[PDB]
UniProtKB/TrEMBL annotation:
This is Alr2278 protein. Heme b binds at residues 2, 74, 105, 116, 134, 136, 138. Keywords: Heme, Iron, Metal-binding. The lineage of its organism: Bacteria, Bacillati, Cyanobacteriota, Cyanophyceae, Nostocales. The keyword Secreted does not apply. The keyword Metal-binding applies.
């Protein structure tokens, strides 16, 4: 993934746990040779997976729990590190934002030519609920989607309840989430 993602991981870990913990995690991930991440440069996805696994080991937390935390963090991180207007352009409610997500990633994709973005499709079931179909070239990031939705909830001052109904890992075509939202 692009360096931006790995910077945000470092920033979250450093902020919550301090630089020493960050360095420990970086070392264990086998990434000691990397002085700093370059935001607009493409990295092997392995770099990201190794960081997550190392953080799980070091922090004594399941990787999936860390991914949820990271997903929430990304919503704030992007808004503060150069993508605030882009986020604002994607709308001012949860359902519109999720409708705009592929188009938001297409706009990101202009600047990041090699982007492999997720694909999100909404099926609105009522004015307070929807099914979200998440499709990806990558394994294991459904929990991040969970954190992202909660971050979007805080963003739009909207209560959200998210339940995964289909799992790409457990022999299903793709991840599907049931979302209830009020506001
Ligand atoms: C302006 C805000 C955002 C920017 C700049 C951004 C950019 C990116 C970038 C660079 C990646 C890595 C993909 C790659 O390197 O190939 C990524 C991945 C991802 N993004 Fe976004 N993103 C933004 C907002 C969001 C939001 C609000 C969501 C909420 C669902 C989201 C969902 C995801 C997911 C689930 C991935 C994992 C990659 C995958 O599933 O294959 N992003 N994004
Ligand atoms: Na989709």
């Amino acid at each position: 993934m692009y360096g931006l993602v790995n910077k945000a991981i470092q920033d979250m870990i450093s902020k919550h746990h301090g630089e020493d913990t960050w360095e420990a995690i970086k070392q264990k991930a086998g990434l000691e040779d990397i002085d700093f991440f370059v935001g607009m440069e493409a990295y092997s996805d392995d770099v990201t997976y190794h960081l997550v696994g190392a953080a799980s080991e070091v922090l004594g937390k399941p990787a999936e729990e860390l991914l949820i935390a990271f997903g929430e963090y990304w919503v704030t991180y992007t808004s503060e590190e150069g993508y605030g207007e882009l986020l604002a352009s994607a709308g001012d409610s949860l359902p519109e934002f999720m409708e705009n997500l592929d188009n938001l990633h297409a706009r990101v994709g202009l600047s990041f030519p090699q982007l492999r973005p997720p694909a999100f499709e909404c099926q609105h079931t009522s004015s307070k609920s929807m099914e979200l179909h998440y499709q990806s070239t990558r394994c294991g990031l459904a929990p991040m989607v969970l954190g992202l939705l909660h971050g979007l909830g805080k963003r739009f001052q909207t209560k959200v309840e998210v339940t995964q109904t289909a799992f790409r890992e457990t022999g299903e075509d793709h991840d599907i989430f049931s979302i209830k939202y009020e506001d």
